Amino acid sequence: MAQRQFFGLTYNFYGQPAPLFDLNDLQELAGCYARPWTSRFSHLAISTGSLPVWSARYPSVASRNIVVNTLLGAHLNPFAGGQITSHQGITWRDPVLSSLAPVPAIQPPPVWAVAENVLLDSNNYPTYVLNLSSMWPINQDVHIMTMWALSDQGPIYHLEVPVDPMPAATTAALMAYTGVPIAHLAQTAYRFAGQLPQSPDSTMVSTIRWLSAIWFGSLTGRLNRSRTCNGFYFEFAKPALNPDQAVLKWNDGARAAPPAAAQSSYIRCISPHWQHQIVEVAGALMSQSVTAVTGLPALIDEATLPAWSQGVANLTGNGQGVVPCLDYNPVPMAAARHLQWRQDGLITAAQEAQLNNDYTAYALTIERHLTAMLVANPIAAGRMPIQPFNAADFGQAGQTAAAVALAQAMFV
């Protein structure tokens, strides 16, 4: 459980002298908030895609995701520093990291450690490791950070399908949640996992992992009304505009072909649109929780990775689990899914496939233009409350169809 070298990776800056935010933005953060724990962040995220994700400070959910990380990244360098630093805005409310404090009065001596792009090992800091219990909830948060920050893309999400020994208890419970969107399940899960210093009790753990698969499987095409995980799939509600909300649905059609034993993938999203896709994001947050429990195959090998995030400690390698990451552009996948569906003869392409591809084309456009227009500001001012990214990044490529095919074969 206490995975000793709990080393976590802080984000790089987009050819910036400073970490990604300006002083005002960080003020906003620290100050208008208090706790270093994701409650506040989740509050925003949870509101079932109703509220516009846009604000003056915070362009998207994912935006906030990024400034959450950078916040972390900067302010940790303080207390996680070699001999303890902390000033300029943040001087930690107690050594045990209780709250984001504006500089305690007679406390200058712990400097503001000017770091560059640097991973840190939580357990190498004596304060941190003393407080192993309280460390646990924040490590979760940490992972979230690291696993966006590792790359320059949409989140590196992990998948797991342990085949065969499947707890009967899991089944039973999970059925009761039928009707709800992935989002709220996730929320409860994270809350639990934090609330109790994390357990070896695989219950929780297994459950999240199964869920993740079923979602992903659904989203691909592999999983649907007629091809289920025993009854399990995720139903994409409202077939018009692109908001097609994945609810957990239990319908008995077929029980899909039990894979060979243990199937693992990781997905990333190459396209900035990820930002407005709460679905995608919520799997990634799921896979983080998973991490806390489990020592996942040493992270997505440096082959698809920017130079600053090569050669990292015990994270990227070359000859390990999951050497390449499975990569997608969200709008091509929807097409992929319709493909399968049609190949199976579930449905006529005629009107179904045409219509939704029409709407997602629209949704792309809207998103693309908004993300670009918003990025313009940070791409001219000293402030960055957003993912950094070029227009060529939107490209319909990035191994999109391979991902899909791999996900599928996984299900065999």
Binding site: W37, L196, K249
Partner: protein, 1027 residues
Amino acid sequence: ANGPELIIEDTGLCTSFMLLDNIPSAHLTKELIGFTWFMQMYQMTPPLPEGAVNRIVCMTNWASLGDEGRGLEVRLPPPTDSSVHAYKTVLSRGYIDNAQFNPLALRSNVLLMLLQFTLSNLKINKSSTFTSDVTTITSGRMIRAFEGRPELLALAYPGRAVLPTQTKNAQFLSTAIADRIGRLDRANLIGGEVSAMVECMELCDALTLHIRETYIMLLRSMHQDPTQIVQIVNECANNLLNSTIPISLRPTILCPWFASSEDLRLQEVMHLVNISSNTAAALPLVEALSTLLRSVTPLVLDPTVLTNAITTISESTTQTISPISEILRLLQPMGNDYAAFWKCIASWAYNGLVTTVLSEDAFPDSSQSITHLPSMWKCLFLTLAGPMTSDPHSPVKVFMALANLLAQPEPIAIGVPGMHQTTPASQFSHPGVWPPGFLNPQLINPQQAPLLRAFAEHIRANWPQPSEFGYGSTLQGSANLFIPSNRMVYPWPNQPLPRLTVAPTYDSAMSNWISTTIAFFIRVVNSVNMTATVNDLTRRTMTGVMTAMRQVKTMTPFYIQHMCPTELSVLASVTVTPPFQVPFTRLVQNDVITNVLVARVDPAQRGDAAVDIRATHATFAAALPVDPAAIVVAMLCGQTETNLIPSHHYGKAFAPLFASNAMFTRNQRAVITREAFVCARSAVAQCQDAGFLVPRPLDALRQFDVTSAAAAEIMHAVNDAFKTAFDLDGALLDGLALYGDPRIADLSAAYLQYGGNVVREHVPPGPSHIHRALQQVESTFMAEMNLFNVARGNLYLVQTATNGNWSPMAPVAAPPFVRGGPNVRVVGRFGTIVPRPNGLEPQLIDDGNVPRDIAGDWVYPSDVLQVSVAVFRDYVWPMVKAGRTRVLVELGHYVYTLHYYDPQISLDEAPILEEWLSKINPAGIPPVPFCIPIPQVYPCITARRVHYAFTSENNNDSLFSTNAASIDTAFGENAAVSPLRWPGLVDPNYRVGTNDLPNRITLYNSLYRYNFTYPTLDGIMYVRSAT
């Protein structure tokens, strides 16, 4: 029992703003018709407000068609009428005059209003029923069939309406996307069950929606599934007790009971703080727990048993010495007394604050030497008792008891004159007072004081150790402050209990200590020095006793070691007060507790922990004098039942206890506690400078120099607001207010150990849906103010004698309203005037000394006006009224009371404004008079229109429509409805959930309404009574 009111339900409509007509038109005109009139004409009732002047106004829950009343609603009147009273409520104590309000008090008062807007909107939007509207009027549309009042439908669904006229309103409606009326999708898949939710396009308020959305997300977070509930109980039960795990699909189960430790913790402290200063307050609680314990235990205290045992010894009547009778008589033969003994056990769980101390009753009364055998017995009582007390200092007293008796046979190494030979044991209740002798036994002359040495050596060696045990559940943790999660400490050692039958197991810690003590006294009796002095016969008997007493069959020690651990577990989960423990030492001087502490406040950055806290802050440890004799009785005569099977016994016994669902309800309280804390802070940080990052929006809203006193006022009202809202009698926050200054809640959970060891524990507060909503309201307010009748800018008072409709409400503010203005001169100076010297006109002192006629451009700060009203009215007014001194009234933001008048006639504002002017007080202002001519729908003539007041900012936003049910608006022309208000309905482009904040409040969008049952915790699961 005051349970929280979490579940508040709305049906009907999710809207705290009203679309309102302010003036319909009665036959207008003769040579035409009132196009407006057509309403009744076709017998239908329009869904939209169709007359001449129509506005929107803030009315909380106005369209609530629920049987549920929360009764904290924010009701505002049309800007037409004076809403003065809403904004003077909080602090206008000193300013009794009903017309006028105190400008400085404004940010505060608004801030509360907003707070309450939020709170009387914490509401589960619940699904009613749905109808398949297959008709002409509806496109097969799924309408909300409200069981009564058809009216509401119309209003909820504009789109339903047919088009008889080619009117302004018609025009709008006929340019908007019609299909989005009622229910697009219903959400259930479970076959033969009703829906989980409906997805309906409704007349719905985004801001209100948002509030309600959040609340739901908060509730959802706390909600727990059957399985997890099962866990919690099984764990708590420690398999002794048993519940029926159902294999059933999960029927949308609404039970928000689960709360984080965090909150329980802050409830606890709050509880602790409200225990004002007297030690006795702890006693009733601890008493009650002792009775509960007594009633639950499979135990028998039958002292009587004892007496028989001792009656076995036969001896010569010649001896005056009766050890037997002395004992009996001393013991207070009663069998009711058990309180002291129970208390001991109970007290082991609350050492951090509730203590049992060894008292000056059953204390060697005579002291003397070793004359009196009674006084011997006296020590034996103590030494037995002592280890049972939550007193860290007990071994010291245990020694010193005897050391007292030993005054004169041998001298001992005593301290200062303080710590004299004859100072009672009792006094030795401080780490600093731990005697040299005691601390080094090995020094004490072996040859000279053999017995006393022996006894101390016995103390050191055979003293009981602290052990540890579990309780609670994993999923949640524990509400353990100073102690690790799920773990409690026992001062005694914990020997595990198997699911077996009976045994008198002498192999206990306690047994050992009984024995050794008895053998110790035997040695005393037999020591050379004493033997020579005594009747030998007597010596015999003495020893006989002693030994018979040791041979006794006493269960109590076995029970201490075996059963008391779990006893306290079972208690701990359903106790009024969760276990509060602070590390129980043994006999270790360099680590002994002085106190436990609570910190409510911090003067800026004091970190003087131990140096200050010891002497400046609230030292929490209560002390309770417990009675030696009774303890020792119980200890000596402990029995259980003949056919004891613990497994069995415990099954039955514990069973009702865990039937009390009240435990879970505690949780819910604690979360609101937390929430209130947080909310308090952020609000007070908008009037007061705090140590705390907050958003600050209303900084333009001129407020007084807030004191501590004032902040305390504000806090209480906010605090009372919560209390009201969730229907709660018990004390919330209040505690903290009593301490003269509440403005700084900087909280610390602290303790002191004598050797400068403070564990001061700070609790940061997790996320807050309610705070966030408030702030949201706050930001939206910054733009949407005129909806609350609040207006923006400064006034300039100018003679405008005109023909045409210059709306006071919408000024195209290009006159020289500014400092860099041509002849736009400032005057904020006090009192100062130039009367008539040298033929000259009476002049004012400008800013910069220069005296200037009472004609011009005068800029005056409100307050300047205020302090010197009468003067202005006398000297400047003239020139307002009949000359030209354009007077600039720096007000910031303000409130306005509207007037509507007949455009076809000659009006002057002057009486109206005269009233205003004269009304102004150093301590208040009256609402702003904004008289306006009505928009008219026909070519009519011109009249003279004299207005004065024009504003820096457009305030016209609150005006919802003009004329509506009319063909052309001509004279007095205005604007129609705002399409931005219903983006989705208007315009097919908008998928009804786009980021509209803080720009515009949408009034028609997808409302989500839901179907959630509240099942009992005791109901969710089947029972197994067979325990």
